[PDB]
Amino acid sequence: PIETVPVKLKPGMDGPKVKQWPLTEEKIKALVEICTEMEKEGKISKIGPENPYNTPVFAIKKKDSTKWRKLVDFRELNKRTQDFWEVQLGIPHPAGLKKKKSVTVLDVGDAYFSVPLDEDFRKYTAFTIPSINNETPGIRYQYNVLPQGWKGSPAIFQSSMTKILEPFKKQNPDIVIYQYMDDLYVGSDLEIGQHRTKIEELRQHLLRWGPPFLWMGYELHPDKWTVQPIVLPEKDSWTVNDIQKLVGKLNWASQIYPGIKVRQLSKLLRGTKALTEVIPLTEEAELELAENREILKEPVHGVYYDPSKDLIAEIQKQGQGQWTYQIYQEPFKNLKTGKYARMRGAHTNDVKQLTEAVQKITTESIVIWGKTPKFKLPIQKETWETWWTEYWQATWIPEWEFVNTPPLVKLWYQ
Amino acid sequence: MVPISPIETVPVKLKPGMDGPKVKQWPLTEEKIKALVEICTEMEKEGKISKIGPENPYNTPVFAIKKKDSTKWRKLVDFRELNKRTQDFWEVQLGIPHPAGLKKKKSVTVLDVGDAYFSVPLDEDFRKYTAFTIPSINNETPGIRYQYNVLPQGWKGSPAIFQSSMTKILEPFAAQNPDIVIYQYMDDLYVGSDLEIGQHRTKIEELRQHLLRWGLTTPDKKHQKEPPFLWMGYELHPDKWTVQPIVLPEKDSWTVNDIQKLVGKLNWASQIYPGIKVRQLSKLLRGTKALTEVIPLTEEAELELAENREILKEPVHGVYYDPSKDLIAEIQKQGQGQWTYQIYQEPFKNLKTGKYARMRGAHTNDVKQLTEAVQKITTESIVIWGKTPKFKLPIQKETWETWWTEYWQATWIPEWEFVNTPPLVKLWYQLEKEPIVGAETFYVDGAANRETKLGKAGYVTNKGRQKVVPLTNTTNQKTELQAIYLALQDSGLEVNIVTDSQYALGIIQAQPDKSESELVNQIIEQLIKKEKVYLAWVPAHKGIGGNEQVDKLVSA
Ligand SMILES: Cc1cc(/C=C/C#N)cc(C)c1Oc1nc(NC2CCN(Cc3ccc(S(C)(=O)=O)cc3)CC2)nc2ncccc12
Ligand SMILES: [Mg+2]
C-alpha cells in the first residue's frame, strides 16, 4: 500500500484541540514502550511545536490478556472528520448479524497500520504522552498510517479488507461478517466446535494476507439475547400498597401502550386505608388487570429505527449488582430493553459494573444497528470521569451524559 | 573553526487566510532614532537581524524606551499585530510541576542559556513577516529596514520554539544520563543529581561539552543566588518547600479587590497551610464587578479571616516526594460545605495540603461532598505523583456501605480506611423500603392558586386524623412539601406517607441532609427525629382514595 487517500475535515472546522487527561505512572510507562516500537516501525513520528492539535490517549488491557494496548480517544476528531462514502454510497448494516447463533469479535485494528495516511491529514492525529507532574515535556507524536479508533480507518481500508475476506466469504456463503471500527464481527449459525476453528481459519487468512491482539476472540450469542417486557405482579392478596404501586406502573405504561385503564383498580382504593391492608380484588378490577396484562404482551406499535437519529441508552442501578437499560430514539418507543446481573469482578464496585454495562450495551447496539448509543449514566460526572478508563476494555468509546435527578421510572423496570 | 550542528528550524505559518502585519511606523525623536540605529547595528553584526530592500511590504512598529538608572535606551518591537496573525503553537510550558511531586536532589546547578537563545534560527520563509523600519533623521532618507533571523523577543512563537529546540538538543544527554534531571525555566537550565559534588560537576562539564556541539556557550548563572529558589510563587529549599511568605493585610475598609487578593492568597496558601477556609470571605463577592466597591464584613468572615491568621502565624513547609514510600490522603469536614485535606508519606510530614468547597446547589449531603473531595484529590494526586493515595476518611465503613448499596446512582471511593476524627460523616435518616405495619398512613396533598398565590396543604389518615392549613404566597411545589412536613409533625415515630408529588419525591430520593430551602430543612429535621418513614408515591387525579379526598380538601 503506497497510494494515500485524500481526507479532509468538515467545512469550517479546525482539527481537535483536546486536553490530555492525567495518566498513572504505569499507563505512561506502557505507552512509552508501545510508542517507541511504533516509532521504530514507522507508524508514528515525533512532531514539533508548530502542531497545536491534540487528542487524548491512554492504555487498556483487553479482556483476559497481558499486554497493554494503546487506545486513542478520537471522538472529537471522528466528529470533525468528513463523512465518508469511500468507494460506495454506504454499506447496508447487516440485519442478519443479530440473528446468528454465535458471533465472534476480532480486533483487526493492526491491519490499518499497513496503509499510509494522507500526509496533509497527519497533523490532526497529534497526541501527547504526558509526564508525571509536568516534570519533563510531553512526548508529541502524529500518525503516518491509518490509526486505530479513527472513523476513516475502516472506511479507507474497506477496499483492502473486502478482498482479503473474498475467498473466505465465497467459501462460506452463510457466514455473516460485519466491520465496525477496529472490530470484525463474524457470525455463524453452526455450533461451537466449528466456530473457533472457522474463526481461526479467518485469523490465518489475515496473517497470510498480512498482530498483537489478533489471536483473541470475543464470543457472543445474540440469538439468546433476552428482552425485558413489562410485567405486572400476580398475587393472591393485594395490599393497598401493592395496588398503589400497580396503578403507578400501569399509569406509566399507558404512555407507551394504548388502552391501559386503571379505573376499576383505582376504585379499590376508596377511602383512606392503611397501606398494609389487604383489599380483595373485584372481578371488574380483575378483568381490567387481565386486559392490561394482555396489552402489555404485544409489542409497542409504531416503533421503527431511524438511521438519521441518534440511539439513546438509559441505565438504572437496581441494586445487588443488577442493572436495567432501554435503547430508544424517541421517548416511550423502546427499540430494545434489557437487564444485567452478576457483573464479574465488581461485586463491591458500582463504577466498574456500570462501565461493563456500558460496554455490553454498546456491543449490542453495534450488532443490531451498526452504531453506538449516547448514554444517560446514573452517576455524577466527576465520579464517572475519574474512574471509567480503569475498567475500559473496548477499542471504541461511545458518548455519554449524566443523570443527576433520580428517575421515578427505576421502580417500573424492577 | 570547529563545525557546529545547525539547530533544526521549526516551520511557521500565519493563521489561514490572514496575511502578515502592515502597521505604520510612528514618528520618533532624533535622539530615539540615533539610539535605535546603534542598537540595531550591533544586533545586525550579531546575526540577529538583517537589512532588507524596499520590496518587503510588511511592517511592525519599533519604539525606544528609557530606563531609570541605566541611562541607556532600549528598543521595543511591538509584535502585537504579528502575534494576532501568527498560527497557534503547542505551548509545552502550560503545566508547572507542583513542588510536592519533586524529588530531593543532593546537588543542583544553574546554567544561563539566554545566549543559546539567539542560536535558534527563525524559519526563513517566515522572516519577511518580522520587518520593521527605523525612521530616518528628519525623514530625508529612506528608513532603514530590517527583519529578524532569530526568534524575536515578544513574538508569539518564541517561548514554544525555543523550549522545543532546547528539549530536542538535550534529549540524548538526558536519556543517556538517567542519574540526573534537567529542567528549563525561561533563560536558565537547572541540573540536579544525587551524585557527590565532584561527580556532579563532571556531569555539568559533559553537558557543556554536549551543548557546544550546537555552538551553545553556557556559563554558570552569574551571581549564584543561595537557596531557596524563588520560582512560580514557591520557595524551593534543598529539603523542603513552601509558598513564598503569605502576609494578610490589616485593613479597616475591605473592598472587593481586597478580598479577591485575600482569597487568592488563602487559596495559594492552602496548598501547604492546613485548614485554611474561604467560604465566608468568598460569599461576600457574589455579583459585584466594580473593583472599588467596599463591602462590610459579616461577623462570620471576620471569624474565618481571624482563624486564617492563626494558621498563618508560623511558616509551614512540605516535604518532597519519595517514590519508595506510601502515599496517604486524610480528609476532615470543616462545616458549611468546606473540606480540608493533607497528603503525606510519613505522619506529621505533609507533602501538601488542600481544600474542597461544595458545588452550588439547593440540596446536598455530607457523603456526596466527601465523595467529591475524594475524586478531586485522586485526580490531583494522579497529576502530581502518577498514583492514587490511600485515603483516611471520617466515615465509618458501615455508613459508606449502607450509603452506596442503597444510593440510586453508581458511586465509588478508592481504597480507604476510617479515621475517628469528629465530626464524622453520617447518614441522618434512612427511608423504609416497605410500608410499616401498624404505623398510621397519612395521605398528603397541597395546591396553590397560581394567580393569587393562596394555597392549602394538609393530610387525611386511616385513623381519621385530618388537617388543612391555608397558606399565603405559595406555589404548587411548596404546598406539596408543606403537606409532607405537616404529616411528619403530626405523626408518631413511625409513619407511612402517601404523596402524589413527583417534585417532593425527586428531592427526598436525592437524600439531602441540608438545604437552602428552609422548608426542606424542616422536613429533614423531622426525618432525623423519626424511627421509620415509608414514603409512597401515587399518580394524581386517578381516584386513589385518600389522595383524592385530600386533593379536594386542598384545591379550594
Ligand atoms: C531541577 C529543577 C529546578 C527547578 C527550579 C526552579 C527555579 N527557580 C524546578 C524544577 C521543576 C526542577 O526539576 C526537577 N526538580 C526536582 N527536584 C527539585 C527539588 C527541590 N530542589 C531545591 C534545591 C536543592 C538543592 C539546592 S543546593 C544544590 O543545595 O543549592 C538548591 C535547591 C531542586 C530539585 N526533581 C525533578 N525530578 C524529575 C524531573 C525534574 C525535576
Ligand atoms: Mg393534587
CATH number at residue A253: 3.30.70.270
Q: A272 vs B368: CB contact, 8 Å cut-off? A: no
- Whose grid coordinates read 514539533? A48
Asked if residue A1 belongs to a domain, the reply is no
Q: How far apart are CA A15 and CA A74, in angstroms?
A: 11
Q: Do A101 and A85 belong together in one domain?
A: no
Q: A270 vs B545: CB contact, 8 Å cut-off? A: yes
Asked if residue A185 belongs to a domain, the reply is yes
Q: Do A150 and A11 belong together in one domain?
A: yes
- Chain B residues with CB inside 8 Å of A277's CB? 462
* Percent of residues in chain A assigned helix, strand, coil, to nearest 5: 35, 20, 45
Of A273, A272, A314, A266, the C-alpha closest to A292 is A266
What DSSP state is assigned to residue B480? H
Grid cell of B139 as nine digits: 525623514
Directed axis angle between helix B518-529 and helix B476-490, to 10°?
A: 20
- Chain B residues with CB inside 8 Å of A132's CB? 101, 383-386
Cα separation values, B551 from A248, B480, B554, Å = 17, 11, 5
Grid cell of B196 as nine digits: 557527590
Asked if residue A381 belongs to a domain, the reply is yes
Name which of A124, A127, A134 to mutate to probe chain B: the one with the most chain B Cβ atoms within 10 A of its Cβ. Answer: A134
Closest residue by CA, ligand 1 atom 24: B238
- Order the strands of the A322-328 sheet from edge to edge: A334-340, A322-328, A312-319, A374-377, A399-402
Q: How far apart are CA B403 and CA A251, in angstroms?
A: 30
Q: How far apart are CA B233 and CA B225, in angstroms?
A: 16
Asked if residue A326 belongs to a domain, the reply is yes
- Chain B residues with CB inside 8 Å of A350's CB? 404, 410-412
Q: How far apart are CA A55 and CA A128, in angstroms?
A: 8
Q: B536 vs A275: CB contact, 8 Å cut-off? A: yes
Distance from CA of B348 to the nearest CA of A (A): 23
H helix runs in A106-190, sequence order: 152-171
Q: How far is the CA of B9 from the centre of ligand 1 (A)?
A: 30
Q: Do A22 and A86 belong together in one domain?
A: yes
Which of helix, strand or coil describes residue A40? helix
Grid cell of A269 as nine digits: 382504593
Of A74, A70, A75, A44, the C-alpha closest to A59 is A70
Q: B105 CB contacts (<8 Å, ≥6 apart)?
A: B181, B192, B193, B194, B238
- Chain A residues with CB inside 8 Å of B343's CB? none
H helix runs in B329-389, sequence order: 366-385
**H helix or E strand, kind and range, residue B482:** helix B476-490
Q: How far is the CA of B553 from the centre of ligand 2 (A)?
A: 10
- Order the strands of the A139-143 sheet from edge to edge: A44-46, A139-143, A127-129
Directed axis angle between helix B299-311 and helix B256-269, to 10°?
A: 40
Last residue of a domain, one of A203, A219, A235: A219
* A307: exposed, middle or buried (Cβ count in 10 Å: 0-12, 13-18, 19+): exposed
User: At residue B33, what are phi and psi to the nearest 5 degrees?
Assistant: -65, -45
Query: Cα B66 to the chain's mean position, in Å?
Result: 38
Of B160, B410, B545, the CB nearest to A350: B410
| Chain A contact for B536 (CB, 8 A cutoff) | yes
Q: Which domain holds residue A34?
A: 6-95+121-161
Around B223, how many Cα atoms within 13 Å sit in the side-chain half-sphere? 0
Of B427, B408, B437, the C-alpha closest to B527 is B427
Q: Do A343 and A386 belong together in one domain?
A: yes
Last residue of a domain, one of A219, A235, A260: A219
Kindly give the pairing relationship between strand B363-364 and strand B514-515.
antiparallel
Grid cell of A98 as nine digits: 443479530
Which residues in A236-321 belong to E strands, given as ranges? 238-239, 278-279, 312-319
Q: Do A110 and A169 belong together in one domain?
A: yes
Number of domains in chain A: 4
User: At residue B457, what are phi and psi to the nearest 5 degrees?
Assistant: -135, 155
Q: How far apart are CA B515 and CA B361, in angstroms?
A: 8
Q: Do A210 and A300 belong together in one domain?
A: no
Of A176, A45, A30, A2, the C-alpha closest to A104 is A176
Q: How far apart are CA B401 and CA B407, in angstroms?
A: 10
Q: A323 - beta bridge partners? A: A317, A340
Grid cell of A249 as nine digits: 406502573
Whether the Cβ atoms of residue B164 and residue B92 lie closer than 8 Å to each other: yes
Domains and CATH numbers, chain B: 99-119+158-212 (3.30.70.270), 230-318 (3.30.70.270), 322-427 (3.30.70.270), 440-554 (3.30.420.10)
Grid cell of B511 as nine digits: 437524600
**H helix or E strand, kind and range, residue B205:** helix B197-212
Query: Cα B60 to the chain's mean position, in Å?
Result: 37
Whether the Cβ atoms of residue A199 and residue A216 lie closer than 8 Å to each other: no
Whether the Cβ atoms of residue B339 and residue B369 lie closer than 8 Å to each other: yes
Per residue in A42-81, is it b (16+ CB within 10 Å) or e — as a string?
ebbeebbbbbbbbbbbbbbebeeeeebbbbbbbbbbbebb
Asked if residue A132 belongs to a domain, the reply is yes
Q: How far apart are CA A129 and CA A72, in angstroms?
A: 11
Q: Do A21 and A83 belong together in one domain?
A: yes
Whether the Cβ atoms of residue B444 and residue B497 lie closer than 8 Å to each other: yes
Of A52, A135, A271, the CB nearest to B545: A271
What DSSP state is assigned to residue B518? H
One-letter amino acid of A323 = W
Resolution for this experimental structure (Å): 2.0
**H helix or E strand, kind and range, residue B554:** helix B547-554
> Scanning every residue of chain B, which has its alpha carbon at the shortest distance from the alpha carbon of A141?
B90
Q: Do A176 and A209 belong together in one domain?
A: yes
Whether the Cβ atoms of residue B73 and residue B65 lie closer than 8 Å to each other: yes
Ligand 1 site-directed mutation target among B92, B103, B107, B108, most atoms within 8 Å of CB: B108
Q: A155 CB contacts (<8 Å, ≥6 apart)?
A: A84, A86
Q: How far is the CA of A414 from the centre of ligand 2 (A)?
A: 27
Which of helix, strand or coil describes residue A343? coil
- Whose grid coordinates read 471500527? A181
Q: B456 CB contacts (<8 Å, ≥6 apart)?
A: B446, B447, B448, B468, B469, B470, B471, B479, B553, B554, B555, B556
Q: Do A268 and A355 belong together in one domain?
A: no
Grid cell of B338 as nine digits: 468546606
Kindly give the pairing relationship between strand B390-393 and strand B328-335.
parallel
Q: How far is the CA of B316 from the centre of ligand 1 (A)?
A: 19
* A306: exposed, middle or buried (Cβ count in 10 Å: 0-12, 13-18, 19+): exposed
| Chain A contact for B542 (CB, 8 A cutoff) | yes
Q: How far apart are CA A266 and CA B378, in angstroms?
A: 52
Residue B322: other Cβ atoms inside 10 A: 13
User: At residue A95, what are phi and psi to the nearest 5 degrees?
Assistant: -65, -15
Of B97, B536, B542, the CB nearest to A135: B97
Whether the Cβ atoms of residue B512 and residue B527 lie closer than 8 Å to each other: no
Query: Ligand 1 site: residues with CB under 6 angstroms?
Result: A 135; B 97, 102-103, 105, 107-108, 181, 183, 185, 190, 192, 227, 229, 231, 236, 238, 320
Whether the Cβ atoms of residue A184 and residue A168 lie closer than 8 Å to each other: no
Q: Do A296 and A381 belong together in one domain?
A: no
Q: How far apart are CA A257 and CA A251, in angstroms?
A: 10
Which of helix, strand or coil describes residue A106? strand
Q: How far is the CA of B500 from the centre of ligand 2 (A)?
A: 7
Q: Is the dihedral of CA B379, B384, B390, B395 positive or negative?
A: negative
Ligand 1 site-directed mutation target among B190, B224, B232, B385, most atoms within 8 Å of CB: B190
Of B185, B271, B166, B276, the C-alpha closest to B230 is B185
Directed axis angle between helix B366-385 and helix B397-406, to 10°?
A: 100
Chain A to chain B, count of Cβ pairs less than 8 Å apart? Answer: 187
Whether the Cβ atoms of residue B29 and residue B183 lie closer than 8 Å to each other: no
Q: How far apart are CA A403 and CA B312, in angstroms?
A: 42
Q: Do A199 and A254 belong together in one domain?
A: no
Last residue of a domain, one of A258, A290, A305: A305
Residue A375: other Cβ atoms inside 10 A: 26
User: At residue B467, what are phi and psi to the nearest 5 degrees?
Assistant: -155, 135
Q: How far is the CA of B527 from the centre of ligand 2 (A)?
A: 23
Q: How far apart are CA B57 and CA B23, in angstroms?
A: 10
Q: How far apart are CA B132 and CA B158, in angstroms?
A: 18
Q: B119 CB contacts (<8 Å, ≥6 apart)?
A: B7, B150, B214, B215, B216
Q: How far apart are CA B9 and CA B21, in angstroms?
A: 22
Whether the Cβ atoms of residue B411 and residue B441 lie closer than 8 Å to each other: no
Q: How far apart are CA A276 and CA A239, in angstroms?
A: 5
- Whose grid coordinates read 490465518? A204
Asked if residue A84 belongs to a domain, the reply is yes
Of B535, B527, B506, B513, the C-alpha closest to B368 is B513
Q: Do A345 and A407 belong together in one domain?
A: yes
Q: Tell me, what CATH number does A76's domain have?
A: 3.10.10.10
Q: B195 CB contacts (<8 Å, ≥6 apart)?
A: B106, B107, B179, B180, B203
Ligand 1 site-directed mutation target among B110, B188, B236, most atoms within 8 Å of CB: B236
Whether the Cβ atoms of residue A382 and residue A169 lie closer than 8 Å to each other: no
Q: A269 vs B87: CB contact, 8 Å cut-off? A: no
Alpha-carbon dihedral angle through residues B233, B236, B240, B244, given to the nearest 10 degrees: -30
**H helix or E strand, kind and range, residue A350:** helix A350-369
Around A135, how many Cα atoms within 13 Å sit in the side-chain half-sphere? 20
